[PDB]
Amino acid sequence: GIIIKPIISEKMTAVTEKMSERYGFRVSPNANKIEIKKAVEAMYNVKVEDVNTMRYDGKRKNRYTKSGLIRGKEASFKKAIVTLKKGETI
Amino acid sequence: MKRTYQPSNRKRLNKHGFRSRMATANGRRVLAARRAKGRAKLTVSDEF
Amino acid sequence: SKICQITGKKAMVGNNVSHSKRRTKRVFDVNLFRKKFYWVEQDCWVVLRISAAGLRLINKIGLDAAIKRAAEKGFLN
Amino acid sequence: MQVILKEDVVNLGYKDDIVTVKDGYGRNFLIPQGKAVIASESAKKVLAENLRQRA
RNA sequence: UACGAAUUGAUCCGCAGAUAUCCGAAUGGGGCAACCCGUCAGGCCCCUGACACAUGAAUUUUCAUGAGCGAACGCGGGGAACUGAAACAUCUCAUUACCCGUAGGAGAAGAAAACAAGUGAUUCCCUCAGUAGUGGCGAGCGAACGGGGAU
RNA sequence: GGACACGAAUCCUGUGUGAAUGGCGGGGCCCAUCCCGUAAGGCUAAAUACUCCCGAGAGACCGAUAGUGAACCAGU
RNA sequence: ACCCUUGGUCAGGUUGAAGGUUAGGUAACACUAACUGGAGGACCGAAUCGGUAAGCGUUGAAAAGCUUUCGAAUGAACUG
RNA sequence: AGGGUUAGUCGGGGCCUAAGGAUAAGCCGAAUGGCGAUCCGAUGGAAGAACCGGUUAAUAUUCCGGUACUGAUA
RNA sequence: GGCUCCCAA
RNA sequence: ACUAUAGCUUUACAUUGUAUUGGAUACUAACUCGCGGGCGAGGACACUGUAUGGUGGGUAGUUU
Ligand SMILES: [K+]
Ligand SMILES: [K+]
Ligand SMILES: [K+]
Ligand SMILES: [K+]
Ligand SMILES: [Mg+2]
Ligand SMILES: [Mg+2]
Ligand SMILES: [Mg+2]
Ligand SMILES: [Mg+2]
Ligand SMILES: [Mg+2]
Ligand SMILES: [Mg+2]
Ligand SMILES: [Mg+2]
Ligand SMILES: [Mg+2]
Ligand SMILES: [Mg+2]
Ligand SMILES: [Mg+2]
Ligand SMILES: [Mg+2]
Ligand SMILES: [Mg+2]
Ligand code: NA
């Protein structure tokens, strides 16, 4: 299960209202395009055309305790914009 | 005025990195001493 | 690791002592050299790094017996 | 150096006998060149036995 | 805070198991630690998951063993100087500090070619004793025999 | 040359030599008598040293500028 | 600081060496004339490297600077 | 606090070697170790291969539409 | 860029 | 200046042997070097270890 969660955002909504065969997933950072493609085919029973990926490092954050301050980090992830064949949706 | 510290990541890792420390016996001595003191950072390879 | 292969002799640590009894560290070195020997039993030639005392032992009891004794004593390797 | 003589040797006779020589003359010349062999106790016993079998 | 599990016995405690990513002696080859690149046998299907693929020593290519780390204590190889002697060189500090190698639950030592002027293997404690000695006979250093014990 | 309390009898050895088979060694230089022992092969428990760790306890020891650098976010 | 390997940079103007050609001159060289040519730890001067003199600053904008002036600027140059 | 970085063709790496570094066979050396020609090592060599137009609050030779090219594989 | 010239090659 | 000492250097022993009229000559087999993948040139010298005598502000510890 390399797919973590779908991307619900204004940019994804705009690109899906434009193209309607495009869907954005957030996946594990070490999964390459071929396995992302096979995984979405397994999880949704669709034929996939092309995959675009970009790596995000975690945001640095400031955890606040009673006394002072601690420096922490969010987890890294990989974005996967997925183009289905013309005719199918998710 | 040029100051003493002129950063270069390749030079930093070549001079003080984990593999360069592990290469010699005295570098392993330094690593053992830092582990015995209990340092959270062991080499310059730890920082990011 | 320059050690006589027959006797096991190695360099000793001692003192240079002057007339005013000043003492300075020094090394007594082994009279060591490489020599080629004819091994009769195997009919071969063997190069040994030996001392003059080892050469004396070889000339006393034969090269084959000296080699066997050194091997049993662990000097030869 | 105590040597059993194996072949004939000029200026030092006594073939098949016991002789004393300088260590270099015999470690560097005779034993390398086949004639003569160091007179260990075993070789002395064998030489004495060969002499008694000849006689 | 929610949402659930739990008398059909959760949670919790004791013992035994399963799984256990990557780096690191790191050992398939490299490398800027946590990464890059491979070969051979299979299985899937350009890409994947699961095998194997280091080196040295006993050993006869089957086999066990080793490497690295880590408190103090043990043994061994090298080995200072400041200081004291109211300077300083013999001497002292000291066979110390430190560096290096290597064990075990302890290690080392141990059964007289011994001490002595009768005792009877090692080890440790109390005495002998700051004595005998030693020493620019200065500063200093400093036993053993015998006796009493632990074993 | 070194270690032995010892700054040259005992023990060790870099260099060069080198026996004996009752003999040999020791008793503080060297000789003789006397006494003691039997080198150049090996193994061996106990009584002795120490605490990273585990368990059970204690103190005419400290009480937050004290006591560990660190009672807390500490080798931060 | 020095060295090793591998890269990069240097507006514009001036001067006019070796050499070449064509004339005269020689027995032949020599030797004069014009044009050409474009050398140099050469000249003037930006970038750049350096730091002469003065002024300012001296709990400074700065633990060594700023302004004006000044040296070098195809080299024993500067620089990654 | 939420969102944002999209590549067969851009850059890098995968390939190659320099200085230098680590090593093999060997050499040296109380120990720890020091040397020593294949490997590593860019600041150099080789790199196969386009574009005009649109388009976000924030990306674009990477997304969209047209025109292409280049390497493997059946 | 060929090309010319030069030596420090 | 005093005392040492790295280095250099002399001889003896070891490495290290054989013959001839001893200390010279000669020999080759220790030992060293070159070429090719044995041959040539040397040679008991040279080199190195132990001991010994010189030299030693190159270096060190000190005194004045
Ligand atoms: K695409
Ligand atoms: K990408
Ligand atoms: K023992
Ligand atoms: K600059
Ligand atoms: Mg912030
Ligand atoms: Mg490896
Ligand atoms: Mg004093
Ligand atoms: Mg405190
Ligand atoms: Mg100029
Ligand atoms: Mg300027
Ligand atoms: Mg100028
Ligand atoms: Mg390569
Ligand atoms: Mg490059
Ligand atoms: Mg922008
Ligand atoms: Mg001086
Ligand atoms: Mg002093
Ligand atoms: Na590996």
UniProtKB/Swiss-Prot annotation, chain B:
Which GO annotations describe the biological process of this protein?
A: translation
Q: Name one GO molecular function term.
A: structural constituent of ribosome
Q: Which InterPro entries does the entry link to? A: Ribosomal_bL34 (IPR000271), Ribosomal_bL34_CS (IPR020939)
HAMAP family hit by this protein:
Ribosomal_bL34
PANTHER family, per database record: LARGE RIBOSOMAL SUBUNIT PROTEIN BL34M, MITOCHONDRIAL RIBOSOMAL PROTEIN 34 FAMILY MEMBER
The protein's name is Large ribosomal subunit protein bL34
For this UniProt record, give its keywords in alphabetical order, as a comma-separated list.
Ribonucleoprotein, Ribosomal protein
Gene encoding the protein: rpmH
One CC-aspect GO term: ribonucleoprotein complex
What is the top-level taxon of the source organism? Bacteria
Q: Which Gene3D superfamilies match?
A: 1.10.287.3980
In which family does this protein belong, per the annotation? Belongs to the bacterial ribosomal protein bL34 family.
Which is an annotated Pfam family here? Ribosomal_L34
Organism, by scientific name, is Porphyromonas gingivalis (strain ATCC 33277 / DSM 20709 / CIP 103683 / JCM 12257 / NCTC 11834 / 2561)
Curated annotation (Swiss-Prot), chain C:
Would you say which domain of life the source belongs to?
A: Bacteria
Oxidoreductase found in the keyword field: no
GO molecular function terms here? structural constituent of ribosome
Could you confirm whether the keyword Hydrolase appears in this record? no
Q: Which Gene3D superfamilies match?
A: Ribosomal protein L28/L24
Q: Name one GO cellular component term.
A: ribosome
One Pfam family name is Ribosomal_L28
Q: Name one GO biological process term.
A: translation
Cite the InterPro entries for this sequence. Ribosomal_bL28 (IPR026569), Ribosomal_bL28/bL31-like_sf (IPR034704), Ribosomal_bL28_bact-type (IPR001383), Ribosomal_bL28_sf (IPR037147)
User: Keywords, A to Z?
Assistant: Ribonucleoprotein, Ribosomal protein
HAMAP family, per the entry:
Ribosomal_bL28
Spell out the family assignment given in the record's similarity comment: Belongs to the bacterial ribosomal protein bL28 family.
Q: What is this protein called?
A: Large ribosomal subunit protein bL28
Organism of provenance: Porphyromonas gingivalis (strain ATCC 33277 / DSM 20709 / CIP 103683 / JCM 12257 / NCTC 11834 / 2561)
Give the gene name.
Answer: rpmB
Curated annotation (Swiss-Prot), chain D:
**According to the UniProt entry, where is the signal peptide?**
none
Q: What does this protein do?
A: Binds to the 23S rRNA.
Q: Which domain of life is it from?
A: Bacteria
Name this polypeptide is given: Large ribosomal subunit protein bL9
Q: Which family does it belong to?
A: Belongs to the bacterial ribosomal protein bL9 family.
Q: What is the species listed in this Swiss-Prot or TrEMBL entry?
A: Porphyromonas gingivalis (strain ATCC 33277 / DSM 20709 / CIP 103683 / JCM 12257 / NCTC 11834 / 2561)
